[PDB]
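Q: Predict the bound structure with A1AXF.
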Amino acid sequence: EVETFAFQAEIAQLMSLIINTFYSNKEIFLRELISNSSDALDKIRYESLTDPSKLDSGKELHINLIPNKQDRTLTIVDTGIGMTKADLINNLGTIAKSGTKAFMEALQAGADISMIGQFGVGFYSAYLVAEKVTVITKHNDDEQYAWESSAGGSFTVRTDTGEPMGRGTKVILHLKEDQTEYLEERRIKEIVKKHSQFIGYPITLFVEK
Ligand SMILES: FC(F)c1cc(N2CCNCC2)ncc1Cl
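A: Predicted complex:
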């Protein structure tokens, strides 16, 4: 059972701006997704202080970066707090509406796309490099879900039947034909060292066949 939803107009406008604006410094997408992973791990770590049973779905707090040249995908996995169905469909997009307005205003005043994370909508920078994004996610209080969008104004949500994750979020970037540089070990290493060197969780860069 696959459910299709429309993005809110402001979010659709944000994604088309990210896809259509000429902007060469695309590598910032990785810093934004890693920063989102770090916040999600912070949240589960804090909640587990007053409720240790919240870690029964996995004690390890880490970030994995997995390239796959055959599938042309880059996957960012974290064992953070994960997202509920209400998050995927409603809450996160609603939160993002204010940050989207402030971001587009700042852009008209001189800011540039690399500052997108200052407005709380850094996740959508995935579309600087990805033609499609799949998010698999598992929150302690809900089921495992797969969210998916190739932009164009709509996204799908479905119950995920694949490998159970325990808890956390998997962002699968299906890269555009001309952005496969982000599948190379030395390029990812350079980006993580440049933008995410003080993240307080172990970041493991997987290597390929
Ligand atoms: F619903 C989706 F558009 C979506 C949004 C999102 N966020 C945007 C707001 N700030 C960070 C969290 N994270 C994951 C997803 Cl799958």
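A: Strands lie at 3-6, 63-68, 73-78, 130-138, 144-149, 154-159, 168-175, 203-205.
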